[PDB]
């Protein structure tokens, strides 16, 4: 007779209908992904339209229940997740305009046609072209040309589209009682109505800035080392005490520094660890790789994979006669149907990636008992952390000697440890300042603290101040260099990567302390540690039914984000960099530029 009873019954009806509808949708999407035809795309699109129409109608029916008159926390969470319709709050003409803007930006990014001025008929696309150019090449002029050309070809066109996009998104967010679109994104980490576990939306910015201020020294030492090694690799194009040029960072933007491993290797004569040949010798295939992953996951006490997984998953490239996308994914089709779609070669990298995807699948299987609307991570940055901790635990030499891929007489030394830690810092520590600066700029542009006639100026000076990266060519206010990234031009939140990088090391430290690991944290293996597996499952089984702060406390014992585990992980490389850079200036001056001589 009350309102909460009606809300509960409506949520029951919605769950029981949406589960079957989403199962059909994901099933059609799977049939498309493993079998690329035209009728399969038709069925996938039709199921997607059905699911979206059902979701919109259910949000319309759910907006009739006020949250202020609901006491149950789980019912309130489900009603709040179902009531957020999105763009339907704005007008119809503005909605269609915003949709066309997004589609145009995505199309211009995906089909960017940049070509050298020497011959217009032949030229390189983004993926098989500019990426390999910025990742493998070494000529300074070539990388500069690639960078500047892609920028002037993409951002110069995306600038007015991005301006109108910003205005329309701010309008939509202010219509949804938010302050701006950045606040709408920060609403993911928001927690309300839980005494002792609350979390505001500006507290996210506060903790992010604090954690980055605590990270600053390690990143500064890594940046000094990389600048020295690049000055060795580029004799007259890098200042010894200045910033690094933006096109020498290993890719189109400088997101990851993984492509500087060969240029910045500590001991180039020591062979980095690789178990591909031991796999080739012992007749290792996809099935054996995934069986070893399942065994690793069941050793910590987590349940093994289901039969439907081994019967329905696409673990090998299905020959040539039928084409399929070869991006590794963890599929939660619903109704207890978990699958993995991955074209796995006989490689150690594919081995670690299979471990990562099976960690995703384990996390999916954990919270399968939660209601439909609560079957997801605690926040946006939990799944990839759960995957990365498994990748780290399975990549250690102890595990590789355990499964018999490494000789028992292997003499691990400080040189290989330092090499591995430096590569890990290039792929991990190198992306944290980039991510933080990009999300800070995007939040400040969504807020209004950056007028549209100051966009690129503030962007570049923030990059120089935070990331320590300087552009090689001055850019006027016609560029939209942020939109040159996939996430900025396709409407994706970027802070999940920062939060995930911190959460994965928090998880690793807690799981290793629960495993009674003695020694450095980078040599930790959670294998055969059922106590750690239980400590992790206690959070994995929650889903998003509890505040993410409580879920984090359930593992690391602390309610808040922290960088102490990451620093404790990278202490050995930190002391090594401190011992190495004592004869070199650490830091950067935000004034020196390669275009002002």
């Amino acid at each position: 007779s009350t309102i909460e009873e009606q809300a509960k019954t409506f949520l029951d009806k919605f769950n029981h209908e949406a589960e079957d509808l989403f199962y059909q949708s994901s099933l059609a999407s799977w049939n498309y992904n493993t079998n690329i035809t035209e009728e399969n795309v038709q069925n996938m699109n039709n199921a997607g339209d059905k699911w979206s129409a059902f979701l919109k109608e259910q949000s319309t029916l759910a907006q009739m229940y006020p949250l202020q008159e609901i006491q149950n926390l789980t019912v309130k969470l489900q009603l709040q997740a179902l009531q957020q319709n999105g763009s339907s709050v704005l007008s119809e003409d503005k909605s269609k305009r915003l949709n066309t803007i997004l589609n145009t930006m995505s199309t211009i990014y995906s089909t960017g046609k940049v070509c050298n001025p020497d011959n217009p008929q032949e030229c390189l696309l983004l993926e098989p072209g500019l990426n390999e150019i910025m990742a493998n090449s070494l000529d300074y002029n070539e990388r500069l040309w690639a960078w500047e050309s892609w920028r002037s070809e993409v951002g110069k066109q995306l600038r007015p589209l991005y301006e109108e996009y910003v205005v329309l998104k701010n309008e939509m967010a202010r219509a949804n009682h938010y302050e701006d679109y950045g606040d709408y994104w920060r609403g993911d980490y928001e927690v309300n109505g839980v005494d002792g576990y609350d979390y505001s939306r500006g507290q996210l910015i506060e903790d992010v800035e604090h954690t980055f201020e605590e990270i600053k020294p390690l990143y500064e030492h890594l940046h000094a080392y990389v600048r020295a090694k690049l000055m060795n690799a580029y004799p007259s194009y890098i200042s010894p005490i200045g910033c690094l040029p933006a096109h020498l960072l290993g890719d189109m933007w400088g997101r990851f520094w993984t492509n500087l491993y060969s240029l910045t290797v500590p001991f180039g004569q020591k062979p980095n660890i690789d178990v591909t040949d031991a796999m080739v010798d012992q007749a290792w295939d996809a099935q054996r790789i995934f069986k070893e992953a399942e065994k690793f996951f069941v050793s910590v006490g987590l349940p093994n994979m289901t039969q439907g997984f081994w019967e329905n998953s696409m673990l090998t490239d299905p020959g040539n006669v039928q084409k399929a996308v070869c991006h590794p994914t963890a599929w939660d089709l619903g109704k207890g149907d978990f699958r993995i779609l991955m074209c796995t070669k006989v490689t150690m990298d594919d081995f670690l990636t299979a471990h990562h995807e099976m960690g995703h699948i384990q996390y999916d299987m954990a919270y399968a008992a939660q209601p439909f609307l609560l079957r997801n991570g605690a926040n946006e940055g939990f799944h990839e952390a759960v995957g990365e901790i498994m990748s780290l635990s399975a990549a250690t030499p102890k595990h590789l000697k355990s499964i018999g891929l490494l000789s028992p007489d292997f003499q691990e030394d400080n040189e290989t440890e330092i090499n591995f830690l430096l590569k890990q810092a290039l792929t991990i520590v190198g992306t944290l300042p980039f991510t933080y600066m990009l999300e800070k700029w995007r939040w400040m542009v969504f807020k209004g603290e950056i007028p549209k006639d100051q966009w690129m100026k503030k962007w570049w000076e923030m990059k120089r101040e935070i990331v320590g990266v300087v552009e090689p060519v001055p850019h006027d206010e016609t560029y939209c260099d942020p939109a040159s990234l996939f996430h900025v031009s396709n409407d994706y939140s970027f802070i999940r990567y920062y939060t995930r990088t911190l959460y994965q090391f928090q998880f690793q430290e807690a799981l290793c302390q629960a495993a009674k690991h003695e020694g450095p944290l980078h040599k930790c293996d959670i294998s055969n540690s059922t106590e750690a597996g239980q400590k992790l499952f206690n959070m994995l089984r929650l889903g998003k039914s509890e505040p993410w702060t409580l879920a984090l406390e359930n593992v690391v014992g602390a309610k808040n984000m922290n960088v102490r585990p990451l620093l404790n992980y990278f202490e050995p490389l930190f002391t090594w960099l401190k011992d190495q850079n004592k004869n070199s200036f650490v830091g950067w001056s935000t004034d020196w530029s390669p275009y002002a001589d």
């Binding site: 007779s1 009873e5 079957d20 029916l61 039969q307 439907g308 109704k335």
Partner: protein, 194 residues
């Protein structure tokens, strides 16, 4: 001295829905429960008060055999003192249960590629069911307070949803054909035993 029609009960082609479970009165025959015990094709065979292998040399007045289909994780509701959408709104057993439950996986028969949406079950009810009572009504459930005149609208929805059975769904969502026996004692003579 006849064999009880267990063939047209277990080996039957299609089982009824859980909200309309088939109720068959078996009597005046000879049933050896040892072959049902040793079939070893069922995943659940549990009852208390009398052992199944020890019950063979016993009989009562009349026996009832309930049969239906549910999901995989819904066979645990078929037990005395349980709570769930099946134990309350679809099929209730008394605490003084005298028979037991026979359930087995039936994906080969009740699951078709594309979805077998022919199995129904009641989701809502104004009050929980009493033990051994059937409800096959089709009236609309009133969640709110205003009458909706037998039409679905706000706070009004058909209280009969369908099981979506697919051959690929996990065991917790696979169709499980459930058979439930009942042994009642009256003042009449015993007619059905080995």
């Amino acid at each position: 001295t006849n064999l009880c029609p267990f063939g047209e009960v277990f080996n039957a082609s299609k089982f009824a829905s859980v909200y309309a479970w088939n109720r068959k009165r078996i009597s005046n025959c000879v049933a050896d429960y040892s072959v049902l015990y040793n079939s070893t094709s069922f995943s659940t065979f549990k009852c208390y008060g009398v052992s199944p292998t020890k019950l063979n040399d016993l009989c009562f007045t009349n026996v009832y055999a309930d049969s239906f289909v549910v999901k995989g994780d819904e066979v645990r509701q078929i037990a005395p003192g349980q709570t769930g959408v099946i134990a309350d709104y679809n099929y209730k057993l008394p605490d003084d249960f005298t028979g037991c439950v026979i359930a087995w996986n039936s994906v080969k028969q009740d699951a078709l590629t594309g979805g077998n949406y022919g199995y129904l079950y009641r989701l809502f009810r104004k009050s929980k069911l009493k033990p051994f009572e059937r409800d096959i009504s089709t009236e609309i459930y009133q969640a709110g307070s205003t009458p909706c005149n037998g039409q679905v609208g706000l706070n009004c929805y058909y209280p009969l949803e369908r099981y979506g059975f697919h051959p690929t769904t996990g065991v917790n969502y696979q169709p499980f054909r459930v058979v439930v026996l009942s042994f009642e004692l009256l003042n009449g003579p015993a007619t059905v035993c080995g």
